[PDB]
């Protein structure tokens, strides 16, 4: 019994490190793609004022 | 924002299972034990320990000693009152 659950936690330990980093990571792009974002916004209202 | 994570941060309770303090026991438990040894103590010689071996252990519960010890105080008495009292 004891075995089984000792089993299963030397592969957790190893892959757990790869998800936290792919986390925060992942994480950190999307704090880029707000930039983006804004790029976006402006145009639509400039075509909007425009249109009235 | 926060990427914590519990899998990892748990290995002061990979200590703190029950059947550790089992497991801890027990390879001390077996750590110099036979595992039915060859052959101890069964039989030995005390020349009265081969009496017990076959009238006392756990071999034979014969009545045979019983027989034999009192078949004795039969043959005690008997010649000794005319000797002692």
């Given amino acids: 019994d004891r075995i089984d659950s000792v089993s299963q936690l030397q592969n957790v330990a190893e892959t757990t490190k790869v998800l936290f980093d792919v986390s925060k990571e992942t994480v950190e792009l999307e704090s880029e793609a707000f930039e983006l974002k804004q790029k976006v916004e402006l145009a639509h209202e400039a075509k909007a004022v425009l249109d009235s | 924002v926060s990427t914590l994570i519990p899998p990892k941060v748990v290995s002061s309770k990979n200590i703190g299972s029950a ?39 756990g071999d034979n519960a014969s009545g045979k000693p019983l027989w034999h010890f009192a078949l004795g105080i039969i043959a005690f008495g008997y010649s000794m009152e005319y000797y002692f009292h």
């Fill in chain 2, 19 to 57: 059947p550790n303090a089992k497991r801890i026991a027990n390879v001390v438990h077996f750590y110099k034990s036979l595992p039915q040894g060859p052959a101890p103590a069964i039989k030995a010689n005390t020349r009265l320990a081969r009496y017990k071996a076959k009238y006392f252990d």
